[PDB]
Amino acid sequence: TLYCFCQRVSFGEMVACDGPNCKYEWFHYDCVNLKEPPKGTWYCPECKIE
Ligand SMILES: [Zn+2]
Ligand SMILES: [Zn+2]
């Protein structure tokens, strides 16, 4: 998926977000500094400041 602040495809790393207002739902783990697959509803830094 082509969604991120740096705008790049999620090649092998795709973490999905839960945000009612969120076009950037898809991300890659390395951008958002993660290696753990989320155990539940993952709010991206954008949703966390909304
Ligand atoms: Zn990125
Ligand atoms: Zn979000």
XYZ file of C-alpha atoms and ligand atoms in Angstrom:
52
model
C 0.000 0.000 0.000
C 1.153 3.539 -0.975
C 0.366 5.440 2.291
C 2.906 7.264 4.563
C 4.316 10.757 5.405
C 7.446 9.911 3.257
C 5.015 8.441 0.585
C 6.428 4.957 -0.193
C 4.952 1.444 -0.642
C 4.840 -0.880 2.409
C 7.393 -3.422 0.967
C 7.304 -6.407 3.404
C 6.474 -4.032 6.342
C 2.762 -3.022 6.589
C 1.253 -1.834 9.906
C -2.420 -0.712 9.620
C -3.954 2.080 11.753
C -7.369 2.466 13.412
C -8.393 6.114 12.861
C -11.971 7.485 12.027
C -10.155 10.427 10.308
C -7.007 8.879 8.732
C -5.922 8.648 5.042
C -2.420 7.540 6.276
C -3.946 4.271 7.808
C -1.149 2.140 6.257
C 2.524 2.548 7.296
C 5.809 0.560 7.393
C 7.204 -0.529 10.812
C 10.700 1.039 10.362
C 9.245 4.582 9.698
C 7.134 4.567 12.909
C 10.001 2.760 14.822
C 8.410 -0.683 15.451
C 9.397 -4.352 15.102
C 6.504 -5.825 17.227
C 3.310 -6.661 15.145
C 0.410 -4.775 17.045
C -1.757 -7.006 19.347
C -4.750 -4.640 18.831
C -6.000 -1.230 17.593
C -2.834 0.655 16.478
C -3.191 4.470 16.537
C -0.620 6.234 14.295
C 1.140 9.420 15.825
C -1.321 11.515 13.691
C -4.450 9.961 15.375
C -2.660 10.238 18.779
C -2.452 14.090 18.302
C -6.031 14.276 16.797
Zn 7.543 6.027 5.347
Zn -4.208 6.960 12.089
